[PDB]
Design a protein around this ligand. Structure first.
Ligand code: HEM
Ligand code: CAM
Ligand code: CYN
Ligand code: K
Ligand code: K
Length: 405
């Protein structure tokens, strides 16, 4: 399924990478994307896959393009085109300065102060889930912890019932890792139809939850519309239900293979925040992009108005020009360079929430279950898309080596 090579794209810039099914997925998803950084591949290439689009392969280019919203607009930030065109989430499909006032509202509901507000529930839930698994001597990490821990905290934060998780999680995954089972537009509108009655209820009777706060905030000197509220809460749903979930899996899969890395963190827990950064770099997982607002020459390459460009947040930190021996996990790296939470004006608003969930996970897991591994003979499959992930992660351990606190 290769789209005909457009006339303005020279043949030597063609590299047919499929972001939804990279050829090297078996070696691990980050490894599969890292083929874009082998010496046979230019800094900036065109793939004919998924409609045809550019991909920046180097951190330097990815950062520049994320900064230059004048040429690289968030209007259409998803490949393929049909998805990016349907995509209307707020603030993510807006450029500055329009984006600005909506993002301040986002920061109000998922930013620092909400982390410190919710920190006790976060710690509480981590300990509770881990203690429940501890005596089993096994778990499916994706389903037993990676999903429920961040997702229940998000549902708590948004004041939504946990019974709604299965339905909302399915729709979220259709947008980031599409199955072909329903169009992006259909998935979005399914999520929108769920939010619509809730937002109306919470406009008429305001609560203190994230959804009440967004639905009742101010932009442009006036009340936010029911439509805008919907477009923002939609993004919060997606933001809350896929990235941390999948990132914890990558990290725990790594730690299952790395007894010496576990001991570093257990013996010197003050290194955990730096370790969090390193895992975020090494196991980075997001890849969206931008659309050209006009013809533009970028690093010697002629881009056309309306061209889509994938600017994989995943690749910046894997770039050997940014980090020596990028595939090696080194908690003492003097500088962990990455754009895992993105870059420029859209730099993730939930990044403080993400970090706290990661750091709490690292500490509390390794405290109670310091010695564990991947199930004997199990093959771990990764999946690739706008947000990449781990399909399943069966872990095992000897309960005699675990500890309650
Ligand atoms: C490891 C975990 C996470 C990663 C890797 C991640 C990644 C990213 C990236 C790369 C962007 C920028 C997308 C773009 O430039 O178009 C973004 C935006 C955003 N994310 Fe996250 N995220 C994580 C966790 C979370 C959490 C827990 C939330 C909770 C709500 C959240 C909510 C948001 C929101 C609201 C935006 C939009 C910001 C804006 O457009 O101004 N994220 N994320
Ligand atoms: C790319 C993202 C990670 C960012 C927040 C959720 C996500 C899937 C978006 O649509 C914007
Ligand atoms: C953000 N996800
Ligand atoms: K390259
Ligand atoms: K759009």
């Amino acid at each position: 399924n290769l789209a005909p090579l457009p006339p303005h794209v020279p043949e030597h810039l063609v590299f047919d990478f499929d972001m939804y099914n990279p050829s090297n997925l078996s070696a691990g998803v980050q490894e599969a994307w890292a083929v874009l950084q082998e010496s046979n591949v230019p800094d900036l290439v065109w793939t004919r896959c998924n409609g045809g689009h550019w991909i920046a392969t180097r951190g330097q280019l990815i950062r520049e393009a994320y900064e230059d919203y004048r040429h690289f607009s968030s209007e259409c930030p998803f490949i393929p085109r049909e998805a990016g065109e349907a995509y209307d989430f707020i603030p993510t499909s807006m450029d500055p300065p329009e984006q600005r006032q909506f993002r301040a509202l986002a920061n109000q509901v998922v930013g620092m102060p909400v982390v410190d507000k919710l920190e006790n529930r976060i710690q509480e839930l981590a300990c509770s889930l881990i203690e429940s698994l501890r005596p089993q001597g096994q778990c499916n990490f994706t389903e037993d912890y990676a999903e429920p821990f961040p997702i229940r905290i998000f549902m708590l934060l948004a004041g939504l019932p946990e019974e709604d998780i299965p339905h909302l999680k399915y729709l979220t995954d259709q947008m980031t890792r599409p199955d072909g089972s329903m169009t992006f537009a259909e998935a979005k509108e399914a999520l929108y139809d769920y939010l619509i009655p809730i937002i109306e209820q919470r406009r008429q009777k305001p609560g203190t939850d994230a959804i009440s706060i967004v639905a009742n905030g101010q932009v442009n000197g006036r009340p936010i519309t029911s439509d805008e509220a919907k477009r923002m809460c939609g993004l919060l749903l997606v933001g809350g239900l896929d990235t941390v979930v999948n990132f914890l899996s990558f990290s725990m899969e790594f730690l299952a293979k790395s007894p010496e890395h576990r001991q570093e963190l257990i013996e010197r827990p003050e290194r955990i925040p730096a370790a969090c950064e390193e895992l975020l770099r090494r196991f980075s997982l997001v890849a969206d992009g931008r659309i050209l607002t006009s013809d533009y020459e970028f690093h010697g390459v002629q881009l056309k108005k309306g061209d889509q460009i994938l600017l994989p947040q995943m690749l910046s930190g894997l770039d050997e020009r940014e980090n020596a021996a990028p595939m090696h996990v080194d908690f003492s790296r003097q500088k962990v360079s990455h754009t895992t939470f993105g870059h420029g004006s859209h730099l993730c608003a939930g990044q403080h929430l993400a970090r706290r969930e990661i750091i709490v996970t690292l500490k509390e897991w390794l405290t109670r279950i310091p010695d564990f591994s991947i199930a004997p003979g199990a093959q771990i499959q990764h999946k690739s898309g706008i947000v990449s992930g781990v399909q399943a992660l069966p872990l095992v351990w000897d309960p005699a080596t675990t500890k309650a606190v």
